[PDB]
Amino acid sequence: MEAAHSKSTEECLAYFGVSETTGLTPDQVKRHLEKYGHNELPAEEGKSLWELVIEQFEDLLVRILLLAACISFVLAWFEEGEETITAFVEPFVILLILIANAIVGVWQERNAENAIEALKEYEPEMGKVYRADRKSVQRIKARDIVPGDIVEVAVGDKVPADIRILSIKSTTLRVDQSILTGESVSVIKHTEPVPDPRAVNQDKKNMLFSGTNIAAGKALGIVATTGVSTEIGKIRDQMAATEQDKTPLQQKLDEFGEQLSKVISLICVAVWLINIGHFNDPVHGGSWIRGAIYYFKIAVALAVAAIPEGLPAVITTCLALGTRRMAKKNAIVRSLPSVETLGCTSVICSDKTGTLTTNQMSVCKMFIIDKVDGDFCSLNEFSITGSTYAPEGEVLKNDKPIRSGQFDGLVELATICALCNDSSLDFNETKGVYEKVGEATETALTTLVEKMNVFNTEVRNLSKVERANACNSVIRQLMKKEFTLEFSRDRKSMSVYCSPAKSSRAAVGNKMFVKGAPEGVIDRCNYVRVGTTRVPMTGPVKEKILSVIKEWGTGRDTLRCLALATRDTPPKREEMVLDDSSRFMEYETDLTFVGVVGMLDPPRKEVMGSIQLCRDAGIRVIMITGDNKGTAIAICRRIGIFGENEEVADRAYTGREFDDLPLAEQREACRRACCFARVEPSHKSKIVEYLQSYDEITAMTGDGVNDAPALKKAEIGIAMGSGTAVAKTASEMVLADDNFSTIVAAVEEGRAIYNNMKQFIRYLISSNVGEVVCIFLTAALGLPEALIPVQLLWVNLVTDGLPATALGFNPPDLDIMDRPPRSPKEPLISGWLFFRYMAIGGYVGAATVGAAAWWFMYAEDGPGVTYHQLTHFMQCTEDHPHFEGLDCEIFEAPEPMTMALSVLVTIEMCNALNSLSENQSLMRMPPWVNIWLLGSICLSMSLHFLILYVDPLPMIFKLKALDLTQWLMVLKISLPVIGLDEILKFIARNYLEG
Ligand SMILES: C/C=C(/C)C(=O)O[C@H]1C(C)=C2[C@H]([C@@H]1OC(=O)CCCCCCC)[C@@](C)(OC(C)=O)C[C@H](OC(=O)CCCCCCCCCCCNC(=O)OC(C)(C)C)[C@@]1(O)[C@H]2OC(=O)[C@@]1(C)O
Ligand SMILES: Nc1ncnc2c1ncn2[C@@H]1O[C@H](COP(=O)(O)OP(=O)(O)CP(=O)(O)O)[C@@H](O)[C@H]1O
Ligand SMILES: [Mg+2]
Ligand SMILES: [Mg+2]
Ligand code: NA
């Protein structure tokens, strides 16, 4: 293992003590592999169904439901009557429901994958090495490779392990570092070391990254690191090292169950306590034993009456409808419980280029020297038309079209472009557009030249597959591109060494054409071409050139700038070391300025807008880029991140500056900064760490393996649709169109969803509260069971579901994206609201209980002790001649329970309307504000009726109610609720808030 890419080539061969000629002797292997182990990323930990199922039974609510289903199952085996056979339908369903979870929770998980499981997709199976047990190449297995032994790589290989390169057999070595680094092109490699120990992957040019692919060539190397120590391994760790939290909804889950479990217990405490007399009045008579079976069968009744059985399924049902919904709007939510979190994103750190700007290069201005006298300068500035790389546009100065050949300065600037360019242009018939063959910034140049055909060369008598490069290729036949000095991140420029063909361009042997950042190339210029002549680059001449440079890249224009020059007297060919990039800055001096070229990477429309929405939304937007600060900034104001004129010094730091600042200011910077320029790897995460130190839900967006470590830890990681599998499987959402805006649009559904989601949740809960109250009373008073678990379930599952899940469509507020993103800590039911549902429930609890008992104490179709002596219904067959000479079996009558169970049903089909709104009266928001909710209610009612009329059913529950006698009685109980709410709902006006 060597963090050395900065070491000499022999220095490594030294460290490992290995023969670049022989390799590692089988001993070295046995010893190296035991200090280094195998080159491979650790396997996964997959739980068994056993383990899975067990989690499915680790919720307090699922358990409280399992203990209850036991007591029911246990009771349903204590009667000895032929009629009491439907005894196994209660403890049967409960299980069934609890079973349907485990079932779903497992398949739920079984289909989800690990972001890391996606990484191992980058590990090659075989490798190619050289060791002491053979002269010819040995082809082994990635993992059997050890830090040290000599490995060789070829054009068609995937790089196993991180290799410090020893020697390049090919004439050149190309690499696709795409997946785990900055920008991919055929990145070249060289053998000489890299001085800086703290070098960024891209800058370690003598290296072979594990997983990356060698595009072209065949070179030899010595393995630096193996395994998890390998550059990517270094990542896999990050990801595995991170743990993410439960959506502030799931958070609230445990919370509610924790309590819903405390309460419950307490009841049984109050309950057992109201029947304490049974300790100082019993005559040891025997009817005892049948009194314990009461508490036991009333306790499991208490459970299916405290837990919102059906809720779980209504929520996810609400979410999946929304997934598909956003999917239409190009947004892809990976895992849904995350929609909530998206709904309250505090900040969005998105990259610029790919998403914000369209990334469509096009030269808009050029500028070449026109004349220099004493101190008087004179430039020739231009304008170029054409968004597309498409070779279609016109060159104009002072808005007047202009032939290009008419000016020398241009004819050179033009060639330079065409020659110091590795890109080109290609046209396709499948879509009919002109596509970016190489790198955009280059493919745009190639384009520029096309538009200003310096040679007035007929191109309209040529097809469109030929128009693509007619003007370039011509300038290409005007020089012999001997070789090229690739771009390097320190001289921030590149150059092409050329020769002319024997007769035409003989004038001056070889010359050199360079292009890069104006700062550099310009200093390196000691002269300046004025048409066909040169002059001593002077003080004034320079300022004036940089002044326009700064004008373009800082002005509203927000243009990118390329300074073009040529080295007239290039060093002799054989005196150049075309293969040791260090010296490339030396070969690029004594330069003659030729002119700079400005081009734009236009922001995508809706962004400006989408940026504004965030404002009203209060959602912060941080722009992570690769532009220089001066340009990042501008660009921002151009979109709205900043407002032209705004002071931005503190709100925008740079890749470096940031690293400088101490952990102290690091944090600060982050809560206010909105523009990070020249960002590096770690940053995307350190920030996401500070943005978290401010309890801020923050969005992050990357595209490749290197971005994963953050995308993971970000509350909401957003991966590009044109991004790499891994990253995607790391983010919690994916953008097919990459449009930043799609993020904001997604942040919208995110709130909406949760608002309906939210309410429909409050609806089914309060009801569950009510139910509880019913059993409490049914129990505290002795009164016969008023409602049965087997019932309560049906309700909380169906008669309650269809209105709840229809509520999920409640018309979205108009002010959504006009209120700061929601708080996570904000509880679902509190304050006066608590008081409200605390009352509605206390209402239904009695409305139901009293209902069943009514049919017992006033209804004609079943007279009962009007003195309330039904309370002791427990004792009837006993003291048969006590106070009743009645048919003792009437207490277990169906009519009384269908009474309450129908006043419940209705009260909810009603309460499910004092919901369409929280405080806006129904006359201010009639139920017909939602077509679904109404319809749904009907489907439930024809249903509830299904359990009265369809013979198989009623016998399971209770028999039919006498229409207009008993039903009417039902209505004179429930309907009033609405009032009770409209009344609390009115207590709105009687307080400030609204
Ligand atoms: C429910 C029924 C009852 C009886 C209950 O105990 O509720 C209390 C309680 C706990 C509360 C409240 C409630 O307090 C009372 O009513 C006092 C008890 C008096 C009644 C007893 C008679 C003597 C709450 C409900 O009501 C009011 C109006 O006071 C409101 C609120 O609740 C919310 O905001 C809910 C949002 C939680 C988040 C929703 C998550 C649950 C949804 C999933 C359902 C899982 N169930 C299930 O069966 O799944 C399977 C797989 C099948 C097992 C919450 O104050 C909560 O405490 C909290 O921490 C909160 C923030 O939570
Ligand atoms: N095709 C090209 N050839 C030579 N130099 C180029 C170039 N395109 C840009 N440059 C110059 O080289 C410097 C760096 O190029 P770099 O590869 O970092 O650009 P980039 O801006 O395309 C990254 P990002 O796309 O993430 O914003 C630029 O700041 C510019 O001055
Ligand atoms: Mg570039
Ligand atoms: Mg990137
Ligand atoms: Na996460």
Which two structure tokens, joined as six digits, stand for 325? 């919904």
Is 782 within any annotated ligand binding site?
Answer: no
Q: Which of 474, 468, 439, 414 is nearest to 597 (CA)?
A: 414
Closest CA to ligand 1's atom 23? 267
Atom of ligand 2 nearest to the CA of 517: 31
Atom of ligand 1 nearest to the CA of 59: 53
Looking at domain 346-358+603-745, does it have CATH number 3.40.50.1000? yes
Atom of ligand 2 nearest to the CA of 439: 1
Residue among 162, 351, 601, 981 flagged as catalytic: 351
Phi then psi for residue 280, to 5 deg, are: -120, 45
**CA-to-CA distance for 956 and 509, rounded, in angstroms?**
103
Query: Rounded to the nearest whole angstrom, what is the distance from the C-alpha of residue 254 to the centroid of ligand 1?
Result: 10
Contact of 225 with 147, CB cutoff 8 Å: yes
Helix axis angle, 292-303 to 248-274, nearest 10°: 160
Closest CA to ligand 2's atom 21? 626
558 Rama class: left (phi>0) / alpha (psi -120 to 50) / beta? left
Q: Which of 665, 736, 674 is nearest to 350 (CA)?
A: 674
Q: Indicate the burial class of 397 (C-beta count within 10 angstroms; 0-12, 13-18, 19 or more).
A: middle
Three-state DSSP at 512 gives strand
Q: Which of 664, 656, 659, 597 is nearest to 629 (CA)?
A: 656
Is 113 within any annotated ligand binding site?
Answer: no
Question: Is 89 a pocket residue for ligand 1 (Cβ < 6 Å)?
Answer: no
The ligand that comes nearest to the alpha carbon of residue 732 is 5
Q: Which of 763, 809, 814, 812 is nearest to 933 (CA)?
A: 809
Is 35 within any annotated ligand binding site?
Answer: no
**Apex 716 CA angle, 713 and 718, nearest 5:** 105
Question: Is 101 a pocket residue for ligand 1 (Cβ < 6 Å)?
Answer: yes
Which two structure tokens, joined as six digits, stand for 798? 């169906």
Is 37 within any annotated ligand binding site?
Answer: no
**Apex 136 CA angle, 163 and 176, nearest 5:** 30
Residue that has been written with the tokens 């038309």 in this structure: 385
- Count Cβ neighbours within 10 Å for each residue of 629-659 and write b for 16 or more, e otherwise: bebbbbbbbbbbbbeeeeebeebbbbbeebe
Three-state DSSP at 934 gives helix
Which two structure tokens, joined as six digits, stand for 68? 């209850």
Is 799 within any annotated ligand binding site?
Answer: yes
**Apex 547 CA angle, 391 and 532, nearest 5:** 60
Contact of 850 with 858, CB cutoff 8 Å: no
CATH architecture of 55-112+241-345+746-994: Up-down Bundle (1.20)
Contact of 345 with 798, CB cutoff 8 Å: no
Is 617 within any annotated ligand binding site?
Answer: no
Is 706 within any annotated ligand binding site?
Answer: yes
Three-state DSSP at 199 gives coil
460 Rama class: left (phi>0) / alpha (psi -120 to 50) / beta? alpha
Closest CA to ligand 1's atom 19? 263
Q: Which of 138, 137, 123, 156 is nearest to 38 (CA)?
A: 123
**CA-to-CA distance for 246 and 225, rounded, in angstroms?**
36
SS3 assignment for 582-614: HHHCHHHCCEEEEEEEEECCCECCHHHHHHHHH
**CA-to-CA distance for 526 and 209, rounded, in angstroms?**
40
Query: Rounded to the nearest whole angstrom, what is the distance from the C-alpha of residue 716 to the centroid of ligand 5?
Result: 6
- The amino acid present at 392, given as its one-letter code, is E
Contact of 823 with 251, CB cutoff 8 Å: no
**CA-to-CA distance for 666 and 664, rounded, in angstroms?**
5
**CA-to-CA distance for 743 and 324, rounded, in angstroms?**
16
**CA-to-CA distance for 60 and 53, rounded, in angstroms?**
14
Query: Rounded to the nearest whole angstrom, what is the distance from the C-alpha of residue 782 to the centroid of ligand 5?
Result: 51
Task: Tell me which of 417, 562, 722 to substitute to probe ligand 2's pocket, judged by most ligand atoms within 8 Å of the beta carbon.
Answer: 562
Task: Tell me the CB-side half-sphere exposure of residue 335, using CA atoms within 13 A.
Answer: 21
The ligand that comes nearest to the alpha carbon of residue 69 is 1
| Residue 279 CA: distances (Å) to CA of 73, 272, 286, 735, 780 | 29, 11, 14, 69, 16
Task: Tell me the CB-side half-sphere exposure of residue 634, using CA atoms within 13 A.
Answer: 19
State which CATH number among 3.40.50.300, 3.40.1110.10, 3.40.50.720, 3.30.70.890 fits the domain covering 359-602: 3.40.1110.10
416 Rama class: left (phi>0) / alpha (psi -120 to 50) / beta? alpha
Give the alpha-carbon dihedral of 14, 17, 20, 22, to 10 degrees.
Answer: 160
**CA-to-CA distance for 740 and 608, rounded, in angstroms?**
10
Contact of 625 with 679, CB cutoff 8 Å: yes
Query: Rounded to the nearest whole angstrom, what is the distance from the C-alpha of residue 735 to the centroid of ligand 4?
Result: 15
Closest CA to ligand 2's atom 8? 441
Q: Which of 872, 885, 905, 714 is nearest to 794 (CA)?
A: 905
Which two structure tokens, joined as six digits, stand for 804? 């709840």
Closest CA to ligand 2's atom 9? 441
Which two structure tokens, joined as six digits, stand for 379? 């430039």
Contact of 804 with 763, CB cutoff 8 Å: yes
Which two structure tokens, joined as six digits, stand for 604? 């995508």
Q: Which of 135, 162, 143 is nearest to 230 (CA)?
A: 162
β-strands 511-516, 493-499 pairing: antiparallel
β-strands 480-488, 425-427 pairing: unpaired
Query: Rounded to the nearest whole angstrom, what is the distance from the C-alpha of residue 561 to the centroid of ligand 2?
Result: 10
**CA-to-CA distance for 841 and 776, rounded, in angstroms?**
12
Is 365 within any annotated ligand binding site?
Answer: no
Contact of 841 with 766, CB cutoff 8 Å: yes
Task: Tell me which of 353, 419, 492 to substitute to probe ligand 2's pocket, judged by most ligand atoms within 8 Å of the beta carbon.
Answer: 492
Atom of ligand 1 nearest to the CA of 264: 6
Say whether 351 is catalytic.
Answer: yes
Query: Rounded to the nearest whole angstrom, what is the distance from the C-alpha of residue 254 to the centroid of ligand 5?
Result: 19
SS3 assignment for 897-931: HHHHHHHHHHHHHHHCCCCCCCCCCCCCCCHHHCH
Residues within a 6 A CB radius of ligand 2? 183, 353, 439, 441-442, 487, 492-494, 515-517, 625-627
Q: Which of 578, 680, 678, 707 is nearest to 188 (CA)?
A: 578
Is 515 within any annotated ligand binding site?
Answer: yes
**CA-to-CA distance for 959 and 615, rounded, in angstroms?**
59
Contact of 212 with 176, CB cutoff 8 Å: yes
Which two structure tokens, joined as six digits, stand for 118? 């996606």
- Give the length of the chain: 994
Which two structure tokens, joined as six digits, stand for 425? 């242009």
Q: Where are the alpha helices (DSSP H) in 468-508?
A: 470-476
Atom of ligand 2 nearest to the CA of 489: 14
**CA-to-CA distance for 317 and 805, rounded, in angstroms?**
7
Contact of 383 with 397, CB cutoff 8 Å: yes
Query: Rounded to the nearest whole angstrom, what is the distance from the C-alpha of residue 590 to the centroid of ligand 2?
Result: 23
SS3 assignment for 60-74: HHHHHHHHHHHHHHH
Closest CA to ligand 1's atom 36? 828
Q: Which of 346, 356, 347 is nearest to 631 (CA)?
A: 356
Closest CA to ligand 2's atom 16? 626
Contact of 299 with 74, CB cutoff 8 Å: no
Q: Where are the alpha helices (DSSP H) in 494-647?
A: 518-524, 539-554, 606-617, 629-639
Ordered by start, the domain boundaries in the chain are 12-54+113-240, 55-112+241-345+746-994, 346-358+603-745, 359-602
Q: What resolution does the deposited structure have, in angstroms?
A: 3.3
Last residue before each break in the chain (C–N > 2.5 Å): none
Helix axis angle, 894-911 to 831-857, nearest 10°: 150
Q: Which of 96, 163, 155, 98 is nearest to 130 (CA)?
A: 163
Is 435 within any annotated ligand binding site?
Answer: no
Closest CA to ligand 1's atom 59? 256
**CA-to-CA distance for 61 and 52, rounded, in angstroms?**
17
Question: Is 773 a pocket residue for ligand 1 (Cβ < 6 Å)?
Answer: yes
Phi then psi for residue 109, to 5 deg, are: -70, -50
- The amino acid present at 688, given as its one-letter code, is V
Query: Rounded to the nearest whole angstrom, what is the distance from the C-alpha of residue 769 to the centroid of ligand 1?
Result: 7
Closest CA to ligand 1's atom 5? 260
Is 800 within any annotated ligand binding site?
Answer: yes
| Residue 402 CA: distances (Å) to CA of 199, 317, 545, 564, 594 | 47, 64, 22, 21, 19
731 Rama class: left (phi>0) / alpha (psi -120 to 50) / beta? beta
SS3 assignment for 287-319: CCHHHHHHHHHHHHHHHCCCCCCCHHHHHHHHH
Three-state DSSP at 697 gives coil
Task: Tell me which of 259, 793, 911 to substitute to probe ligand 1's pocket, judged by most ligand atoms within 8 Å of the beta carbon.
Answer: 259
**CA-to-CA distance for 708 and 239, rounded, in angstroms?**
7
**CA-to-CA distance for 959 and 902, rounded, in angstroms?**
11
Query: Rounded to the nearest whole angstrom, what is the distance from the C-alpha of residue 347 to the centroid of ligand 4?
Result: 19
Three-state DSSP at 713 gives helix
Query: Rounded to the nearest whole angstrom, what is the distance from the C-alpha of residue 256 to the centroid of ligand 1?
Result: 5
Query: Rounded to 5, what percent of the chain is helix, strand, coil?
Result: 45, 15, 40
Task: Tell me the CB-side half-sphere exposure of residue 180, using CA atoms within 13 A.
Answer: 21
Which two structure tokens, joined as six digits, stand for 178? 């795409």
Contact of 672 with 622, CB cutoff 8 Å: no
- Element holding 623 (H helix, E strand): strand 620-625
CB within 8 A of 591, min separation 6: which ones? 514, 521, 524, 525, 526, 527, 565, 566, 567
Q: Is the dihedral of CA 783, 784, 788, 791 positive or negative?
A: negative
Which two structure tokens, joined as six digits, stand for 278? 């049974």
Q: Which of 149, 157, 152 is nearest to 224 (CA)?
A: 149
Q: Is the dihedral of CA 297, 300, 304, 309 positive or negative?
A: negative
CA 53 to chain centre: 28
**CA-to-CA distance for 126 and 142, rounded, in angstroms?**
5
CB within 8 A of 863, min separation 6: which ones? none
**CA-to-CA distance for 223 and 670, rounded, in angstroms?**
39
Atom of ligand 2 nearest to the CA of 351: 26
* DSSP, residue by residue, 148-190: SSEEEEETTEE--SEEEEEEE-SS--EEE-GGGSS--S-EE--
The ligand that comes nearest to the alpha carbon of residue 722 is 4
**CA-to-CA distance for 552 and 560, rounded, in angstroms?**
8
Residue that has been written with the tokens 């609405």 in this structure: 978
Question: Is 260 a pocket residue for ligand 1 (Cβ < 6 Å)?
Answer: yes
CATH of the domain spanning 12-54+113-240: 2.70.150.10
Task: Tell me which of 62, 249, 765, 981 to substitute to probe ligand 1's pocket, judged by most ligand atoms within 8 Å of the beta carbon.
Answer: 765
**CA-to-CA distance for 119 and 239, rounded, in angstroms?**
11
The ligand that comes nearest to the alpha carbon of residue 678 is 2
Question: Is 765 a pocket residue for ligand 1 (Cβ < 6 Å)?
Answer: yes
**CA-to-CA distance for 763 and 154, rounded, in angstroms?**
65
User: For residue 929, how many other CB atoms are within 10 A of its CB?
Assistant: 16
When computed from its CA atoms, the radius of gyration of the chain, rounded to whole angstroms, is 39
**Structure letter (DSSP) for residue 349:** E
Closest CA to ligand 2's atom 31? 517
| Residue 216 CA: distances (Å) to CA of 157, 174, 213, 222 | 9, 5, 9, 19
